[PDB]
Structure formats: structure tokens, C-alpha cells
């Protein structure tokens, strides 16, 4: 429906987000993803770390400079397990992934913009309670992403500036809501109340 969609990757699941992201791509909704270090995976840390090490040991026997790249950072993990879902070798693939832009944290301009989610991939919904999961930021930090303390800091700055925004917006919407309330019990409003507004 929109030109652009801006996903928060928090409390989310890699496979089940990758899937919908792929289909929305190949139907043509340009997508950006952010906060991928707040992402999550089913299964415990040790399981996911061993799944990563078994990939890690796989390179070309004779020359590693051409062989598989064991990318570390979380956005690139999500991109890995998305380009497995699309035909990157073709041109339709490459012209899908020229619609995908994946980041950590929320850099600009997107921090001022509307973050969304996907309910059919959330952890809290699409898992049972009383069950494990792994934080991707911690996993990447445990296999050599050397950056985790920094996105923390910038997330702090964005959080405080957004809370200071939220105060203003809450006050202003309080004012307009009080105004519309005072605008109530007036026939110009009562007609709309009859017609569902």
C-alpha cells in the first residue's frame, strides 16, 4: 500500500521474517529493515552457535579468498538467510535485493520514520511460552562482531530524543483531544456521530 516499509527487527524470528520479506520484495514493496541486533531465533544459544560454527568451518579447500564468506554481522546473517530464499543468481533476484536495505540500530533518516512489525513472525505470538531463544546481537558478538557496545549507545541517544519528542506529541494530542471533546455535544459533531465519525 505504501512506497516504503520500515521494519523493526525486534522480538522477531529470522526465518519467518525472511519469508514475508522475500515475497513482499518480489511483488515489489521496497523494504528497509533496522534494529537487526534486537532480533531473535528459536533454539538455545549453544544450538545456534554450533549451527554457525558448522558453517564457519566450510571454505574452499585450496584458496579461501574466493570461497564462502562467513559474514558475522547480524544484518548480513539475515541477508544470508534471505538470499537463500531468493534467486540472487538471476536478475530478478538482484532486482529484488536492490529493494532491500538492512541496517543495525536505526540510523537516519529512518529514526524519524514509522517503524512497523509483522505479527505472523513475532516471537511472543509464533512461539509457545516457557521456551528458549537466542539473541542475535549476542551471537554475532560471540563470533566476532566487535561493535555491540556502540549501537547500544546510539540506541540510547535515539531513545532519549524520541522520548523528548513523545512528551511534546502527547501534550499536543492532549490539547487537540480536549478541543475535540469540547467540540463534542454540538450538532455538527452529532451528525458525524450518527454517520460513524
Amino acid at each position: 500500500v505504501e512506497p516504503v516499509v520500515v521494519i523493526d527487527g525486534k522480538g522477531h524470528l529470522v526465518g519467518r521474517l525472511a519469508s514475508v520479506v522475500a515475497k513482499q520484495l518480489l511483488n515489489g514493496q521496497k523494504i528497509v529493515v533496522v534494529r537487526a541486533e534486537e532480533l531473535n531465533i528459536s533454539g538455545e544459544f549453544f544450538r545456534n552457535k554450533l549451527k554457525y560454527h558448522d558453517f564457519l568451518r566450510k571454505a574452499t579447500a585450496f584458496n579461501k579468498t574466493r570461497g564462502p564468506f562467513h559474514f558475522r554481522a547480524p544484518s548480513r546473517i539475515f541477508y544470508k538467510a534471505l538470499r537463500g530464499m531468493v534467486s540472487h543468481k538471476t536478475a530478478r533476484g538482484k532486482a529484488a535485493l536492490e529493494r532491500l536495505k538492512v541496517f543495525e540500530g536505526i540510523p537516519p533518516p529512518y529514526d524519524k520514520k514509522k517503524r512497523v512489525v509483522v505479527p505472523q513472525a513475532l516471537r511472543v505470538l509464533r512461539l509457545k511460552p516457557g521456551r528458549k531463544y537466542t539473541t542475535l546481537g549476542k551471537l554475532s558478538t560471540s563470533v566476532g562482531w566487535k561493535y555491540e557496545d556502540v549501537v547500544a549507545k546510539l540506541e540510547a541517544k535515539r531513545k532519549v530524543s524520541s522520548a523528548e519528542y513523545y512528551a511534546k506529541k502527547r501534550a499536543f494530542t492532549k490539547k487537540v483531544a480536549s478541543a475535540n471533546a469540547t467540540a463534542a455535544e454540538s450538532d455538527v459533531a452529532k451528525q458525524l456521530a450518527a454517520l460513524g465519525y
Binding site: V5, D8, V20, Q24, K114, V116, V117, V118, P119, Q120, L122, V124, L125, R126, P129
Partner: protein, 170 residues
């Protein structure tokens, strides 16, 4: 499938010097009439040495249960032939009608013992009108009075893919 209850009554053969072999009925569970008839011959062969050519149906009657509204804690005896040799069972159910109860039971055996419908003889199904004859706990715990319990963490299901709310259960 969506099971049904069926009366089936059969008669060995009209024959000279043995007219009207006495009668043979069964209470039978199936989706339609034909599977009832086939299960009827299948169990009826087991009881004694007769066949479909040496057999015949008297008639059948579909059985609508008398009290749909009434909860009825049933208890049922079953024999079945598993992967290994056969063995028996008694189970305890809190369901509405015999048909919905056994429809749940066949699924339950299908889960817990890989019980397909062929190898599972309904020995008997019954009602337990009073308390103090239930043995199990996974029925008993629903029966105390003033009973209440919550449904936490309802997994809602949106049709849309995106949403703008970072949702909440309740």
C-alpha cells in the same frame, strides 16, 4: 472423518431347515453407511464362521443421540493391534456425545500410539453418571465446583502482514 453412530443388524442366511438364524446386531462408528457395513462384516466374521455370501443385513438405523446439550463423562474400553502385538485399554473422557468423544479418541490414539482406524476395535463406550468411579486425573480436575481458569497469552492472528502497533495480548 466426521464420525457417526450406526445400528447394524445382520442375519446369516434365509435357509431351509434353519430359517431365521437368530439375529446379530452391533453398535458401529463410521462416517457413512458403507464403512459401517464393512466393519460389521469384519467383526462379525471374527465372532463366528460366516461370510458376506453366508451373511446378509437385516436393516440399519442411524442413531441421533438423545441429549446433545448434556456433558457426559464417558469411559471406554478398547483393544487394538499396535506395531507390536495386541493389548487392551480403559480410558476416560469428558465430551458431549459418543460421536464427538470417539472422534477425539481416535485422533488421540493416532497421536499417542500411531493408531490407524483399521486396527482398533471399539470394545465398548459408556457413560459414567456419578462421580467416585473416575480413576484418572486429566478428567477429574475439570469437575470441582466454582471452577474457573484463565486463557493467558491468546495468540491473535492478523490477516494483514504489517501492523503498526507492536501488539499486546489482552
Amino acid at each position: 472423518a466426521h464420525f457417526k453412530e450406526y445400528q447394524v443388524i445382520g442375519r446369516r442366511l434365509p435357509t431351509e431347515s434353519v430359517p431365521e438364524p437368530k439375529l446379530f446386531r452391533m453398535r458401529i462408528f463410521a462416517s457413512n453407511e458403507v464403512i459401517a457395513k464393512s466393519r460389521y462384516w469384519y467383526f462379525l466374521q471374527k465372532l463366528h464362521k460366516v461370510k458376506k455370501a453366508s451373511g446378509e443385513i437385516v436393516s440399519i438405523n442411524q442413531i441421533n443421540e438423545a441429549h446433545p446439550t448434556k456433558v457426559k463423562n464417558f469411559g471406554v474400553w478398547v483393544r487394538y493391534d499396535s506395531r507390536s502385538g495386541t493389548h487392551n485399554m480403559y480410558k476416560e473422557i469428558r465430551d458431549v456425545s459418543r460421536v464427538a468423544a470417539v472422534e477425539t479418541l481416535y485422533q488421540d490414539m493416532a497421536a499417542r500410539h500411531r493408531a490407524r482406524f483399521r486396527s482398533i476395535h471399539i470394545l465398548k463406550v459408556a457413560e459414567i453418571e456419578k462421580t467416585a468411579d473416575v480413576k484418572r486425573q486429566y478428567v477429574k480436575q475439570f469437575l470441582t465446583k466454582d471452577l474457573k481458569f484463565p486463557l493467558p497469552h491468546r495468540v491473535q492472528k492478523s490477516t494483514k502482514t504489517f501492523s503498526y502497533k507492536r501488539p499486546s495480548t489482552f
